[PDB]
Coordinates of N, CA and C and ligand atoms in Angstrom, one line a residue:
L1 N 147.5 63.1 154.2 CA 146.4 63.9 153.7 C 146.7 64.3 152.2
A2 N 148.0 64.6 151.9 CA 148.3 64.9 150.5 C 147.7 63.9 149.5
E3 N 148.0 62.6 149.8 CA 147.6 61.6 148.8 C 146.1 61.3 148.9
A4 N 145.5 61.5 150.1 CA 144.0 61.4 150.2 C 143.4 62.4 149.2
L5 N 143.9 63.6 149.2 CA 143.4 64.6 148.3 C 143.7 64.3 146.8
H6 N 144.8 63.7 146.5 CA 145.1 63.3 145.2 C 144.1 62.3 144.7
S7 N 143.7 61.3 145.6 CA 142.8 60.3 145.2 C 141.4 60.8 145.0
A8 N 141.0 61.7 145.9 CA 139.7 62.4 145.9 C 139.5 63.1 144.6
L9 N 140.6 63.8 144.1 CA 140.6 64.6 142.9 C 140.5 63.8 141.7
Ligands
LIG1 MN1 149.7 61.2 144.2

């Protein structure tokens, strides 16, 4: 989830 958020951002 951390990196999902990074990509989303
Ligand atoms: Mn990242």
